[PDB]
Design an enzyme around this catalytic site. Structure first.
Site, mmCIF file in Angstrom:
data_model
loop_
_atom_site.group_PDB
_atom_site.id
_atom_site.type_symbol
_atom_site.label_atom_id
_atom_site.label_comp_id
_atom_site.label_asym_id
_atom_site.label_seq_id
_atom_site.Cartn_x
_atom_site.Cartn_y
_atom_site.Cartn_z
ATOM 1 N N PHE A 73 0.841 -1.251 0.117
ATOM 2 C CA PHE A 73 -0.045 -0.037 0.194
ATOM 3 C C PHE A 73 0.859 1.141 -0.053
ATOM 4 O O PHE A 73 1.814 1.208 0.428
ATOM 5 C CB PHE A 73 -0.890 0.106 1.278
ATOM 6 C CG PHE A 73 -1.854 -1.100 1.447
ATOM 7 C CD1 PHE A 73 -3.020 -0.784 0.617
ATOM 8 C CD2 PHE A 73 -1.800 -2.094 2.125
ATOM 9 C CE1 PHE A 73 -3.902 -2.011 0.489
ATOM 10 C CE2 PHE A 73 -2.817 -3.220 1.960
ATOM 11 C CZ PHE A 73 -3.878 -3.016 1.273
ATOM 12 N N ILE A 120 1.881 -7.348 4.956
ATOM 13 C CA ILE A 120 1.504 -5.944 4.482
ATOM 14 C C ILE A 120 2.614 -5.105 4.292
ATOM 15 O O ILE A 120 3.324 -5.139 5.303
ATOM 16 C CB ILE A 120 0.687 -5.472 5.545
ATOM 17 C CG1 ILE A 120 -0.482 -6.485 5.603
ATOM 18 C CG2 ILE A 120 -0.138 -4.101 4.967
ATOM 19 C CD1 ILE A 120 -1.431 -6.877 4.529
ATOM 20 N N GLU A 121 2.967 -4.608 3.105
ATOM 21 C CA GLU A 121 3.880 -3.645 2.877
ATOM 22 C C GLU A 121 3.507 -2.321 2.792
ATOM 23 O O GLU A 121 2.508 -2.024 1.794
ATOM 24 C CB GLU A 121 4.734 -4.128 1.581
ATOM 25 C CG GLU A 121 5.975 -3.142 1.230
ATOM 26 C CD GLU A 121 6.496 -3.697 -0.006
ATOM 27 O OE1 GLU A 121 5.981 -4.671 -0.431
ATOM 28 O OE2 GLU A 121 7.430 -3.098 -0.624
ATOM 29 N N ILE A 122 3.546 -1.534 3.768
ATOM 30 C CA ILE A 122 3.266 0.085 3.761
ATOM 31 C C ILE A 122 4.507 0.806 2.957
ATOM 32 O O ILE A 122 5.473 0.855 3.726
ATOM 33 C CB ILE A 122 2.716 0.508 5.033
ATOM 34 C CG1 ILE A 122 1.657 -0.319 5.701
ATOM 35 C CG2 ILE A 122 2.558 1.940 5.154
ATOM 36 C CD1 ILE A 122 0.438 -0.218 4.937
#
Length: 126
Positions: A73, A120-122
């Site tokens: 994201f 989840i990759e921010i």
């Protein structure tokens, strides 16, 4: 056929409530209910539909699997401010701020995991 963007995607989870709390409290997404009993998480101009095991609406993927997702994201929030928020939330960082390749250019990212194990990759563009 000309594709413009991804509209949404489906995540298969073991428990919708646990998943909703994580995404609303940690990433600031907004949960909603459509078609009477379907759950989804809204963010920006996109969304993520949630399918609980034993309740996966069809059609669905050939091998629905909790913890199989790997999403990146883009955040408008300063990445360093994001790290702190993640830490203050009691969330463990899988891989600290690290340079990665984004769709458009180089990005600085942080990795965390949701309740089911999905990665989840921010990230933020350099």
């Amino acid at each position: 056929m000309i594709i413009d963007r991804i509209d949404h995607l489906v995540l298969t989870v073991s428990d919708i409530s646990t998943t909703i709390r994580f995404y609303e409290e940690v990433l600031g997404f907004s949960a909603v209910t459509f078609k009477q009993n379907r759950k989804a998480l809204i963010f920006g101009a996109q969304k993520i539909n949630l399918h609980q095991q034993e309740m996966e609406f069809e059609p669905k993927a050939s091998r629905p699997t909790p913890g199989s997702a790997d999403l990146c994201f883009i955040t408008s929030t300063p990445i360093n401010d994001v790290v702190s928020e993640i830490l203050q939330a009691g969330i463990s960082i899988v891989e600290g701020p690290v340079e990665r390749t984004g769709a458009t250019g180089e990005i600085m990212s942080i990795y965390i995991r949701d309740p089911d194990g999905n990665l989840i990759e921010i990230s933020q563009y350099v």
